[PDB]
Design a protein around this ligand. Structure first.
Ligand SMILES: *[C@@H]1O[C@H](CO)[C@@H](O[C@@H]2O[C@H](CO)[C@@H](O[C@@H]3O[C@H](CO)[C@@H](O)[C@H](O)[C@@H]3O)[C@H](O)[C@H]2NC(C)=O)[C@H](O)[C@H]1NC(C)=O
Ligand SMILES: *[C@@H]1O[C@H](CO)[C@@H](O[C@@H]2O[C@H](CO)[C@@H](O[C@@H]3O[C@H](CO)[C@@H](O)[C@H](O)[C@@H]3O)[C@H](O)[C@H]2NC(C)=O)[C@H](O)[C@H]1NC(C)=O
Lengths: 331, 333
């Protein structure tokens, strides 16, 4: 009749436990160690306690806890689930993400935290999360941009839409790889209206980043109250947006990235002499490392426009960078 | 922050539209949608035009806990790049031919806890990427051997959950021939299987191999003969012979391939010879070569006899598999 290992209030489909919409105030007892996906959504959990599971769950890859009343998560809550890849904590009552809260989840690739009551995000909430690619933080009350996350090595989607962001670290945002910008969602926030902000988003629009293209109508700033679509604002003394032009001193060591929109594309660099920059030796001058331009000791004769021809499955990109070599220092 | 359809929460590329007792799918679904959650609603039909838009960015479609009793033969035309589809806990009664054939990138299909009585092999035709199919808690009485039998198999299917159905008979000779990586995810527990010794011998082997399909569910692997339930692993007590290993016998000059029959794909295989030397190579007179990850004898010699060991190395576990070769000093042709 019933599966012996199946906890109360669950439908057990081999390694899937469907325990949703069961009015549960606590996690079912005696969860089996073979569990791969635990769906506890639409319940009435308020605390994810230390020892919510006395056993393992070394096989657990997905934990779904959305639509509960979670307002507390133990500092020990993720010790039992080391191999977790996907965690849905959306639609809960979470308010503050303490230091080291998710730091045990070193295999996690997706974290959903949208539609909570989050007012504070600690600088160390996500420390050690090396595998994390997507972090959804929409529909909260976050007012401090989590600058530490972009100053998470694999993070390629950071959704901070529908929050209380006003001030942005624009210089940090400018230096971000285009593959991160592509998934950095800042729509539906009372951002400060500013020429530099227009310039940031206008660049992203030129590059056709999804973050802008998908949400153009929702990209707001706010000036003395009011709220305006950023692209509706014509700023005085505000230039179009600057082409990419590294400046170096004679003798510098320097790496220049091919700033593609998406990872894993095929990159070929062509020098200003119209020669292919080769990956080969450890001698000088210019070479390609990892897919970036590398100059061991920049010379006057280096410099000019280098072009990276990048090829993907769905699109290509042609990105130019001007190296300007200065024969003097101004300090 | 809309573009957001009426009864949905839109979090960039995620639409969460669950538990709103919707009788139809929200209108004007945005093309940027990556995951669409319409679970715990009142949908009864997934019609040809559930989405006029076309959701080429959709990878997950969650439709569990609805009242779905009908899916259009064109329902999956708009979601060509779908990887994960949950149709569990619905009222689905038949799996019509070619029903999922538009889902050529689908990796996981959940159909557990429905009213499915009969599985048509053609419902899953051309699903080249389908890795996991969950069909537990239905009323299935015939084992769909065509899903996994060499000839017309789904090539990447590595988990087939048929637990908690109405299975009485299995195609045991067909199941024995399967690679252990398929057997490892073939779940047959909590079915009224007829007790017989061939049944015991199959599961006895799987148990010795520590396949998850057995190790995780030993207590739910039961059989009926007669109207009383027995645990399959009690059949040794009833005088059934244990699992019989294991030849292998060759004649001089034979050409022979021996698989390292590991329970997970993608493991590194290292073969060692009866003389305790690594096999190696692919030249290859003649006389131990390793090809793909298989032991290969182009022309068996009497010196080639003995026990060969395959050490298989994976991320989470390792296996050691031994095969004994016996060589006759003559050839019958
Ligand atoms: C979801 O779980 C919570 C936590 O148990 C439930 O909240 C609790 O609801 C009960 C009413 O069912 C409240 O009981 C009352 O408590 C006060 C003292 O606090 C007492 O004076 C009353 O006589 C009464 O017994 C309880 O306060 C409340 N606890 C909390 C922390 O809010 C909730 O009902 C559960 N929801 C469902 C619908 O399953
Ligand atoms: C969403 O789907 C659920 C399906 O369960 C609907 O709930 C069901 O609603 C019907 C009424 O439409 C309820 O039936 C009633 O039963 C009583 C007593 O026998 C009878 O006097 C009424 O005339 C009617 O037949 C039924 O109890 C209820 N089922 C459950 C499980 O709660 C719900 O109506 C649907 N929502 C929408 C918005 O369509």
């Amino acid at each position: 009749r019933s599966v012996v290992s199946c906890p109360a209030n669950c439908l057990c489909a081999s390694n899937i436990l469907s325990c949703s919409k069961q009015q549960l105030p606590n996690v079912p007892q005696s969860l089996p160690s073979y569990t791969a996906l635990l769906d506890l959504s639409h319940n009435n959990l308020s605390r994810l306690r230390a020892e919510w599971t006395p056993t393992r769950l070394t096989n657990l890859h997905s934990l779904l806890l959305s639509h509960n009343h979670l307002n507390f998560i133990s500092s020990e809550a993720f010790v039992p689930v080391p191999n977790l890849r996907y965690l849905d904590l959306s639609s809960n009552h979470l308010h503050t993400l303490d230091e080291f809260l998710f730091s045990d989840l070193q295999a996690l690739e997706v974290l959903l935290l949208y539609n909570n009551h989050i007012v504070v995000v600690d600088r160390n909430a996500f420390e050690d999360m090396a595998q994390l690619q997507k972090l959804y933080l929409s529909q909260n009350q976050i007012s401090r941009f989590p600058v530490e996350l972009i100053k998470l090595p694999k993070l390629m989607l950071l959704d901070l839409s529908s929050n209380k962001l006003k001030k942005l670290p624009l210089t940090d945002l400018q230096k971000l790889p285009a593959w991160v910008k592509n998934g950095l969602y800042l729509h539906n926030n009372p951002l400060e209206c500013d020429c530099k902000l227009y310039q940031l988003f206008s660049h992203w629009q030129y590059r056709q980043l999804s973050s802008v293209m998908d949400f153009q109508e929702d990209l707001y700033c706010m000036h003395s109250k009011k709220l305006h679509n950023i692209f509706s604002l014509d700023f005085f003394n505000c230039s179009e947006y600057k082409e990419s032009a590294w400046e170096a001193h004679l003798g510098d060591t320097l790496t220049i990235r091919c700033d593609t929109k998406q990872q894993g594309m095929t990159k070929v660099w062509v020098s200003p002499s119209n020669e292919q920059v080769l990956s080969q030796g450890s001698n000088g001058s210019v070479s390609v490392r990892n897919g970036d331009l590398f100059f061991k000791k920049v010379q006057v004769e280096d410099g000019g426009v280098y072009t990276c021809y990048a090829m993907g499955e769905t699109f290509n990109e042609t990105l130019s960078v001007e190296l300007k070599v200065y024969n003097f220092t101004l300090h």
